Amino acid sequence: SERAYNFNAGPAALPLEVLERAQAEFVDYQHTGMSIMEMSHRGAVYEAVHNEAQARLLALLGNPTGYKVLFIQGGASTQFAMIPMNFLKEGQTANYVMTGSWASKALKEAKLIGDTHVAASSEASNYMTLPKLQEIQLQDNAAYLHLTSNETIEGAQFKAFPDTGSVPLIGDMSSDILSRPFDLNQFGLVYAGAQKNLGPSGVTVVIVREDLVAESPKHLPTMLRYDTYVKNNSLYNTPPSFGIYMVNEVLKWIEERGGLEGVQQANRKKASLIYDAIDQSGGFYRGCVDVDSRSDMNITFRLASEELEKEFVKASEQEGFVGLKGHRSVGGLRASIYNAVPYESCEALVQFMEHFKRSRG
Amino acid sequence: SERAYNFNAGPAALPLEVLERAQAEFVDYQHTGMSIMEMSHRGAVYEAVHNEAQARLLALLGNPTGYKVLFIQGGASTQFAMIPMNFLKEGQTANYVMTGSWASKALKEAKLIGDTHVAASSEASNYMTLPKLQEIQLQDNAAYLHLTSNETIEGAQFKAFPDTGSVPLIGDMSSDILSRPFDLNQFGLVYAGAQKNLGPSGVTVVIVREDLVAESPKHLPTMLRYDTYVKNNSLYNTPPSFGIYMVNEVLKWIEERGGLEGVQQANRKKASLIYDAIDQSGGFYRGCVDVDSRSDMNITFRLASEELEKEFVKASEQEGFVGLKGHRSVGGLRASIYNAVPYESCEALVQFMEHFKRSRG
Ligand SMILES: *Cc1c(COP(=O)(O)O)cnc(C)c1O
Ligand SMILES: *Cc1c(COP(=O)(O)O)cnc(C)c1O
């Protein structure tokens, strides 16, 4: 107890041990006589954690070469504008894969900057079925192909990504980054707000292939050019010091879990338990996406009626559950089971779901 | 001991009691079963601290009306571009008061957006003498007048601000905000990176007069429009949750210190002690600014030679002092004595300075 069953979608759950280690040295970090947040960002102590965070990330990815890890403020949302601002040139078109609410918000910002094109869309099936890699139509003058790896709101997640050739593949991985191993070489730029699966909100991780950002558009404000972060190791202005420190702590933890392949099989156990609960409910619980498009990060499901779903939420909160209330725009229920969400919280959810069913039947 | 004499210029010193209170509830906040950083930004618990922070700030300012407190990411640097992007229209000119390095960086971004004009400059005296309010020449087509209240690097600070009439006065208060009371009604927009005098880095506080940002330029990306923050209470996308929580803790503390008028007389004691040390040194220590332009936040001084200054830094570090190394571009030494820097750290600095002088004479 005193540790709620947290299924929040973002901000979300952080490992208990990383919170404790952070609490232990919160006031006095490594007997330096000060907190990590009272130290200069150009000092030897912070720069060490700053650079180690970047090194641990790539190592977890299998040590790809030719990529830079940048730490930028503004959330994944600011990246919605920064991406077309840096890569969308005149004569070209920003190609987007439409799979849900976040893909839709990414495209909206792009139009403010230049010409856009919908490469594939799953809107015809209400975003219940992800577009197949074959259905993705790329243009000859495409600046890049942007996709949302995991649709946090609708509960859909790509199992594989397409080969875009010379055209840079860009992916919003806010809700599933570092939850499963993938080939970074397929991407030109990968981004993620840290608050979903890496811990603290206030920092956005951007892994960019060096040759794409060597030279940024001169007309852009200094803070919106990628080369400002590259040439300055994300230290041009004061960085989100504490957040980066916490990101490094979560990375150490992922390694303790057996790296990406370890957290993957663990997250795969948590997901199959909850989906099993849904599939063996004889219709009481209904999945919001086609089985093949199912996400292991965000599980969306519904009940027979709107009132029944209202009863579910209330009952779950009275029993310690937090965040099951499905997103306003979609409705229903959503169990967000990121890396740090324990298998026990899922076990508890499956029992609650079984009891609730029987008390309503 | 185990608490170094921290004179860092930013990130900087935070009150020991605020660090301890924050450490106490770091893992379990108010017996909710989770940390403040694992909770939803739309939930009742975070929204309460989020809004209370805004209420405490205005209250400390004497409760001015018609102003909104916004929490934006990107640091004071992003505001360098966001300001002309939102207020510099065609036909108008962005007027700047040039007083040092930060005023100079603010102006540089502005030119990328539109027409600019130097309203007054202290460059002729090497930024040692602030321009007098009378010397400030405003244009008829001025969009606003921007000034840097405290020049963190050179050590100059305005004692009073000008009456700009219909023209909005905008001020960068990163290094002196909430260190002394002022009439907010004189300004249209005031901004400050929090890491200098309000605590944690990762959040920028913007206090804007409501009538100036009711409607932002439609062409701008969503995250760079002020009305996105106003209409959404800075909750359009995930905010710097933990940082805002820490900002609220520092505000409670400032109140315990007797509000703005209390921290002012305290900061005034710390400054006169150090300046006294400089003025009664018979030339060994030399102030970098004219007495009337002296800052109570950042004290810049020099020694007879470059080698002597190198010896000062080394000796001070071996004795527990952090951050006295003057900024690279200016050289010399800088004692940053923000709100949270104890009178004792200043007492210790004055003794060190006296001993060092005698060991070199
Ligand atoms: C959380 C999320 C975002 C928005 O992140 P913010 O930091 O709130 O801007 C964007 N895209 C996806 C896929 C997300 O999950
Ligand atoms: C610290 C400071 C800045 C820059 O703040 P960042 O958060 O590093 O962008 C700008 N102006 C002044 C006056 C400052 O003191």
Structure tokens at B161: 């601000």
Which DSSP string do the residues of A322-358 spell out, in sequence order? ES-B--TTT-SEEEE--TTS-HHHHHHHHHHHHHHHH
Which DSSP string do the residues of B181-239 spell out, in sequence order? ---GGG-SEEEEEHHHHTS-SS-EEEEEEGGGSSS--TTS-GGG-HHHHHHHTT-SS--
Neighboring chain B residues of A31 at a CB cutoff of 8 Å: 2
* Contacts with B41 (C-beta within 8 Å, 6 or more apart), sequence order: A11, A201, B47, B50, B235, B238, B239, B241
Distances (CA, A) of A299 to A160, A248, A263, B116, B302: 19, 27, 17, 52, 62
Assess whether the C-beta atom of B75 lies below 6 angstroms from ligand 2: yes
How many angstroms separate the CA atoms of B172 and B151, rounded? 9
Boundaries of every domain in chain B? 16-257, 258-361
Q: What is the resolution of this structure in A?
A: 2.3
Contact B297/B153 with Cβ under 8 angstroms?
Answer: no
Structure tokens at B106: 């603010």
Query: What number of other Cβ atoms are within 10 A of residue A161's Cβ?
Result: 18
Contact A219/A200 with Cβ under 8 angstroms?
Answer: no
CB nearest B40 (choices: A33, A34, A323): A323
CATH architecture of A16-257: 3-Layer(aba) Sandwich (3.40)
Q: Parallel, antiparallel, or unpaired: how do β-strands B67-72 and B204-209 relate?
A: antiparallel
How many angstroms separate the CA atoms of A254 and A246, rounded? 13
Structure tokens at B84: 């002309």
Q: Three-class SS of residue A101?
A: helix
Assess whether the C-beta atom of A125 lies below 6 angstroms from ligand 2: no
The number of angstroms, rounded, from the C-alpha of B285 to the middle of its chain's C-alpha atoms is 26
Helix (H) or strand (E) holding B335: strand B333-336
Task: Evaluate whether B16-257 and B258-361 have a shared fold.
Answer: no
Question: Which ligand sits nearest to residue B228's alpha carbon?
Answer: 1
Structure tokens at A199: 């811990």
State the smallest CA–CA distance between residue B140 and chain A in angstroms: 27
Helix (H) or strand (E) holding B116: strand B116-121
b/e burial code for range B146-160 (CB count within 10 A of at least 16 → b): bbbbbbbbbbbbbee
Q: Three-class SS of residue A142?
A: strand
Structure tokens at B242: 């933990």
Angle between helices A259-279 and A343-359 (to 10 degrees): 0
Residues paired with A208 in a beta bridge:
A68, A189
Ligand 2 nearest-atom number relative to CA B153: 15
Whether the ω angle into residue A11 lies within 30 degrees of 0, i.e. cis, is yes
Contact B269/B343 with Cβ under 8 angstroms?
Answer: yes
* Contacts with B304 (C-beta within 8 Å, 6 or more apart), sequence order: B283, B284
Q: Determine the length of chain B.
A: 361
Residues belonging to the binding site of A for pyridoxal 5'-phosphate are 76-77, 102, 152, 172, 195, 237-238
In the numeric block, the tokens 């397409």 are attached to: A162
Helix (H) or strand (E) holding A336: strand A333-336
In the numeric block, the tokens 């570092």 are attached to: A178
Q: Three-class SS of residue B269?
A: helix
Query: What number of other Cβ atoms are within 10 A of residue B51's Cβ?
Result: 14
DSSP state of A297: S
In the numeric block, the tokens 């609220």 are attached to: B248
Residue type, position A1, single letter: S
Query: By C-alpha distance, which of A96, A88, A92 is closest to A112?
Result: A88
Contact A11/A322 with Cβ under 8 angstroms?
Answer: no
How many angstroms separate the CA atoms of A242 and B19, rounded? 13
Structure tokens at B326: 């003057």
Task: Select from B98, B102, B191 the residue to mutate for testing ligand 2; criterion: most ligand atoms less than 8 Å from CB.
Answer: B102
How many angstroms separate the CA atoms of B238 and A44, rounded? 31
Ramachandran class of A34: left when φ > 0, alpha when ψ lies in -120 to 50, beta otherwise: beta
Contact B21/B249 with Cβ under 8 angstroms?
Answer: yes
With residues binned 3-state (H G I as helix, E B as strand, rest as coil), the percentages for chain B, rounded to 5, are 40, 15, 40
Residue type, position A52, single letter: E
Residues paired with A283 in a beta bridge:
none
How many angstroms separate the CA atoms of A97 and A171, rounded? 10
Q: Does domain A258-361 have CATH number 3.90.1150.10?
A: yes
Q: Parallel, antiparallel, or unpaired: how do β-strands A67-72 and A204-209 relate?
A: antiparallel
* Contacts with A165 (C-beta within 8 Å, 6 or more apart), sequence order: none
How many angstroms separate the CA atoms of A268 and A348, rounded? 17
How many angstroms separate the CA atoms of B88 and B92, rounded? 6
Query: What number of other Cβ atoms are within 10 A of residue B3's Cβ?
Result: 15
Report, in angstroms and rounded to the nearest whole number, the Rg of chain A calculated over CA atoms.
Answer: 21
**Residue of chain A minimizing CA distance to B241:** A201
Contact A71/A244 with Cβ under 8 angstroms?
Answer: yes
* Contacts with B303 (C-beta within 8 Å, 6 or more apart), sequence order: B284, B285, B286, B309, B312, B332, B333
**Among positive and negative, which fits the CA dihedral A30, A34, A35, A36?**
negative
